[PDB]
């Protein structure tokens, strides 16, 4: 149905996302159990990790387009990522390595992430009809890899330990690299312009130097979240000032603020919603016992099933509004399950969490899939920088929000934790409903401005 390099990119993306979500699914628990962090420390440190992972995506598109070439930067990113995963596995021997290892994952992700999609775009003549379907299958590829990793990585870490789990993340990157190298012949005439000139060793060294520097800066920021906070605060106020100085951009600003709210909520899946499943949900569904950390896999699960359907099925601001209402309902459902449908021992049915994640995933499919695509319709490089900065800030904010659900390590009674989760999730849901209503009200004016 698709060009041959499509299947190469599909499977490279699958395996890279498998490695990443293998880490993400277990990381907060790793912080708590293996490093002895309180849940509060673990949640804010995960927020910092996620902020850096997301904010650095801005680098890899520039490196691939203008310095080294798309295909070269895919290779370099994959290698840095694999090194980061094996370094994380080594951190169990050398605990002091952990932050450096996570910084290496962040920087590796920054170099890699934008480039497979860029490559995929060049596999099709410019107005080919199959592009939309190919990109929906690409999103599904991301979420199949994520589904496998979030399902299996907690099981693997429980049965064989974290070193094995992280080394298997690394192995997934190695096999993404092997499948690329084996299929290299399929993309010989596909690439950005630097891909077809000899590699500049000057630029390569600049990229390696900057990467190493960034790995250390990331390690430091994740170790000292209280200054990552102020860094992103002052960067945010400053870039806001310079955005206001320099009206299709104003709609881009309001859509950016809505995206920030979405990412604050999305950040709850590996933290507060993860420990909510651990502490206050039954760990058995359809008669099978499961690791509750695996409940995170319900997000890619629902995306995989729902992306074709919603591909089969207003315009920009209304789709954003719809997604925000879906996200609101995910958190109101969590609150309601805890407030009214819990057992006498304080435990709720996992079907409520299945529904929570359905709502959240539909919100994702309306917002984040279709965000910078028609931010690119309203717009430049400066707004991309601001986009990645503000969404990184959203992940830091999300770690902070998650800390309101943190449970001290001595608490053992689910009836003590349940009202904490229900209060926080209910307030998240009410605030997000309010935001969705103001979004609805602005849809007509926004839609005029897009004209």
């Amino acid at each position, epitope marked *: 149905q698709q060009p041959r390099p499509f299947f190469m990119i599909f499977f490279v993306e699958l395996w890279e996302r498998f490695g990443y979500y293998g880490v993400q699914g277990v990381l907060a*628990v790793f912080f*708590v*159990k293996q490093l002895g962090f309180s849940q509060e420390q673990a949640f804010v440190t995960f927020g910092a990790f996620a902020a850096l992972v997301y904010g650095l995506i801005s680098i890899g598109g520039y490196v691939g387009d203008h310095l080294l070439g798309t295909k070269r930067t895919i290779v370099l990113g994959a290698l840095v990522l694999a090194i980061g995963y094996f370094m994380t596995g080594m951190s169990l021997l050398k605990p002091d390595l952990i932050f450096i290892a996570l910084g290496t994952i962040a920087v590796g992700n920054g170099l890699f992430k934008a480039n497979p999609a860029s490559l995929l775009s060049k596999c099709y003549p410019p107005k080919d009809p199959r592009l939309d379907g190919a990109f929906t299958l690409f999103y599904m590829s991301i979420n199949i890899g994520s589904l496998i990793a979030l399902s299996l990585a907690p099981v693997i870490a*429980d*049965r064989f*330990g974290y070193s094995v789990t992280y080394n298997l993340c690394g192995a997934g990157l190695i096999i993404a690299l092997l499948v690329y190298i084996a299929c290299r012949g399929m993309v010989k005439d596909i690439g950005s312009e630097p891909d077809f000139r000899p590699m500049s060793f000057s630029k390569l060294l600049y990229v390696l130097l900057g990467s190493v520097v960034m790995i250390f800066v990331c390690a430091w920021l994740m170790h000292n979240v209280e200054v990552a906070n102020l860094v992103l605060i002052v960067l945010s106020i400053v870039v806001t000032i310079i955005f206001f100085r320099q009206n299709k951009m104003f709609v881009a600003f309001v859509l950016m603020l809505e995206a920030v709210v979405f990412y604050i909520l999305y950040a709850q899946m590996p933290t507060s919603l993860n420990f909510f499943a*651990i*502490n*206050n949900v*039954h*760990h*058995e569904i359809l008669g099978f*016992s499961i*690791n*509750p*950390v695996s409940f995170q896999a319900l997000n890619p699960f629902w995306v995989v099933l729902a992306s074709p359907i919603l591909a089969g099925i207003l315009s920009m601001p209304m789709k954003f509004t719809l997604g925000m209402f879906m996200c609101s309902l995910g958190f109101l459902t969590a609150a309601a399950a805890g407030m009214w449908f819990a*057992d*006498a*021992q*304080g*435990l709720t049915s996992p079907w409520f969490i299945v529904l929570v994640y359905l709502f959240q995933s539909l919100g994702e499919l309306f917002i984040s899939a279709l965000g910078l695509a028609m931010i690119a319709a309203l717009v430049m490089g400066f707004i991309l920088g601001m986009w990645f900065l503000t969404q990184a800030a959203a992940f830091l904010l999300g770690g902070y929000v998650a800390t309101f659900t943190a*449970v001290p*390590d*001595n*608490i*053992t*009674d*689910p009836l003590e*934790t349940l009202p904490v989760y229900t209060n926080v999730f209910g307030k998240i849901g009410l605030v997000t409903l309010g935001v969705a209503v103001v979004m609805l009200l602005m849809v007509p004016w926004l839609k005029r401005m897009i004209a």
Partner: nanobody
Framework: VQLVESGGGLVQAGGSLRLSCAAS????????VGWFRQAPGKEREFVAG???????RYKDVVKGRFTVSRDNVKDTVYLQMNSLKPEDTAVYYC?????????????????WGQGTQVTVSS
């Protein structure tokens, strides 16, 4: 995923016994381990437990007499039962639930030992 209990038996009132729970494939380290007991003609009841991060929970009638503790090197959880009384006679079970919570009812736990008879004679 499967727990092996050891250490039951027969003891006179005022004596002591120690139960131990060990797991096989999964590391017990990630699990809250609760001890339940079922006396003749009654339901399983929570007795005592330890969560994955050293938090403790006890039934009222065993406080000051039973101590739950954990050896994370040997991957074992222990129930030390002192000042035993005839009405502590029961089949004792260990149960394991992933995480930090010790729910009071058997349905909160997925993994179960087979049960060890504890008898306390007057």
């Amino acid at each position: 995923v499967q727990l092996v209990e050891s250490g039951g038996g027969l003891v006179q009132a005022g004596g002591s016994l120690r139960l131990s729970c060990a797991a096989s494939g999964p590391t017990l380290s990630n699990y809250a381990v609760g001890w339940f007991r079922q006396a003749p003609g009654k339901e399983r009841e929570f007795v005592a437990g330890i969560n994955w991060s050293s938090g403790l929970r006890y039934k009222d009638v065993v406080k000051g007499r039973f101590t739950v503790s954990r050896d994370n090197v040997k991957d074992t959880v222990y129930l030390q039962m002192n000042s035993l009384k005839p009405e502590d006679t029961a089949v004792y079970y260990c149960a394991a639930r992933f995480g930090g919570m010790l729910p009071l009812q058997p349905s909160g736990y997925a993994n179960w030992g087979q049960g060890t008879q504890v008898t306390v004679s007057s």
